[model samples]
Target: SGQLDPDTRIPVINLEDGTRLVGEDAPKNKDLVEWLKLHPTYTVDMPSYVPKNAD
Candidate 1:
């Protein structure tokens, strides 16, 4: 039996001005940017892939 494991990824958002903000769903930096100005937000599935554990 094989089930897909949870593919956890950091929420990334992009602005019209070409600025990528990660963790908008619940991350820092994005919060600060929000205070600056409200721009068109676009969310995407981004993953920092890791092969295996390091010895």
Candidate 2:
């Protein structure tokens, strides 16, 4: 839901190659989820097609 108020402090998604998805303070996962949900692009994020990124 868009009403996710993330008042917590924690790193949600962090990639090894060097990628971090974080919020300023609260909710961040939903923000990125929403962006990629309708990203309208069929592309591979690399590192692995159906393993690391797909899991």
Candidate 3:
């Protein structure tokens, strides 16, 4: 749901390099999710029901 726990961190991956930002680090830097998607090499692993950058 879009109403996911604020504590629930989403995983963001660098598709070009297979590097990731996950778990605690991911939530701490939640804004990075949309920033990463701005590039061709990045993608996020988030809950199916949660909208990406829906705000």
Among these predictions, the greatest lDDT belongs to 3
Residue pairs in clash, model 3: none
lDDT of each residue in 1-55, candidate 3, tens digit only: 5455545566777788887777665642346555665766877755463564768
Q: What is the C-alpha local distance difference test score of candidate 3?
A: 0.62
* Model 1, span 1-55: residue lDDT tens: 1232334323445655555655434333334335334544654424643324546
Model 2, 1-55: lDDT tens digits are: 2233434233333333434434462233344445445443422232322222333
Q: Give the TM-score of candidate 1.
A: 0.25
lDDT of each: 0.42, 0.36, 0.62
TM-score attained by model 3: 0.49
Q: TM-score, each model?
A: 0.25, 0.25, 0.49
Q: Which parts of model 3 have CA positions greater than 4 angstroms off?
A: 5-7, 27-30, 37-39, 47-49, 52-55
- Which model is ahead, 1 or 2, in terms of lDDT? 1
Order the numbered candidates by TM-score, best leading: 3, 1, 2
**Residue 35 Cα positional deviation in candidate 1, in Å, after optimal superposition:** 14
